[PDB]
Every structure is written in structure tokens, then in C-alpha cells.
């Protein structure tokens, strides 16, 4: 599924990401834009052989099992394919664990490089939320 901008903001809010660990909703929409262009089916291989999955490009090195990342962990206790669903619940619940792991949203390199220090509220401007 490819979400609209305000549609995804609303779904993330419904799932409790708005201001989760102090990160206002625009942070999450910004991250999802650059990670996946709001496409739940996005997958991308990492240089270490792991893969990033879904709208927030959650990796199999640490967070999910895809059966082909030797020596990895599955700290969200989910198959990586669950992160590709049109239902964003698994991606959101796993994102909550990730952002709670100590480094906040810096866990998403794309957030640190493209959203951190920017006017992220712009990503939810005009949305009825």
C-alpha cells in the first residue's frame, strides 16, 4: 500500500506514534517519506547482508527474522514480512521498541540525515488530525 501523506499521519497517530518518546508526528512522517516514499512494500538490502523492510525500513540485522541474515537478532519477535503489510501495526509497534533502545530516532540514519534539525511539522501541515 502507498499511503497519502495525511492518511499516514492519521494512521500513525491512531497507533500512538504522535509524540512517542517526545518525537512529534512530523518526525515519523518525514522518516517514512525518505525511507519508503510511504510504500509499505519497500525492501532494500544493506551492505552487511541484512535487509530493511516496510514503511520505516526496519532492519533484519537486529529487529525481525527473515531467515537469511546469519548471526542476526529478532528483537521485535516478528517475521520481517509482517513489516510489509497494508496494516502498519507491526511496523509501528516495532518502531516503538527501536526508538526506546537508547539512541531515540537516531536509530534511523535517514531521520538523522534528512529530518533532524529541520521543520518536521511541515510534514503534517494542512492535515486534519
33: domain CATH number?
1.10.530.10
Neighbours of 73 (CB within 10 A): 12
* CB 13, CB 128: distance < 8 Å: no
CA atoms within 13 A on the CB side of 21: 14
Q: How far apart are CA 96 and CA 90, in angstroms?
A: 10
- Is 48 annotated in some ligand binding site? no
* CB 28, CB 41: distance < 8 Å: no
| Cell numbers representing residue 88 in the block | 502498519
Residue reference for cell 525481525: 64
Q: What is the resolution of this structure in A?
A: 1.4
Q: How far apart are CA 7 and CA 48, in angstroms?
A: 33
Domain extent for 25: 1-129
Q: How far apart are CA 72 and CA 87, in angstroms?
A: 25
Of 7, 18, 48, 52, which one is the catalytic site residue? 52
Number of domains forming the structure of the chain: 1
Neighbours of 85 (CB within 10 A): 15
Residue 7 appears among annotated catalytic residues: no
Of 7, 18, 35, 66, which one is the catalytic site residue? 35
Residue 52 appears among annotated catalytic residues: yes
The 3-state secondary structure of the chain, one letter per residue: CECCHHHHHHHHHHCCCCCECCECHHHHHHHHHHHHCCECCCEEECCCCCEEECCCCEECCCCCECCCCCCCCCCCCCEHHHHHCCCCHHHHHHHHHHHCCCCHHHHCHHHHHHCCCCCHHHHHCCCCC
Neighbours of 59 (CB within 10 A): 22
Amino acid at each position: 500500500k502507498v499511503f497519502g501523506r495525511c492518511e499516514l499521519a492519521a494512521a500513525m497517530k491512531r497507533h500512538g506514534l504522535d509524540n512517542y518518546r517526545g518525537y512529534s508526528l512530523g518526525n515519523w512522517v518525514c522518516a517514512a517519506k525518505f525511507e519508503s516514499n510511504f510504500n509499505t512494500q519497500a525492501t532494500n538490502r544493506n551492505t552487511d547482508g541484512s535487509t530493511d523492510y516496510g514503511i520505516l525500513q526496519i532492519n533484519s540485522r537486529w529487529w525481525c527474522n527473515d531467515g537469511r541474515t546469519p548471526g542476526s537478532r529478532n528483537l521485535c519477535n516478528i517475521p520481517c514480512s509482517a513489516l510489509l503489510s497494508s496494516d502498519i501495526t507491526a511496523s509501528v509497534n516495532c518502531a516503538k521498541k527501536i526508538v526506546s533502545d537508547g539512541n531515540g530516532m537516531n536509530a534511523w540514519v535517514a531521520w538523522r540525515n534528512r529530518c533532524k534539525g529541520t521543520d518536521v511539522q511541515a510534514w503534517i501541515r494542512g492535515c486534519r488530525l
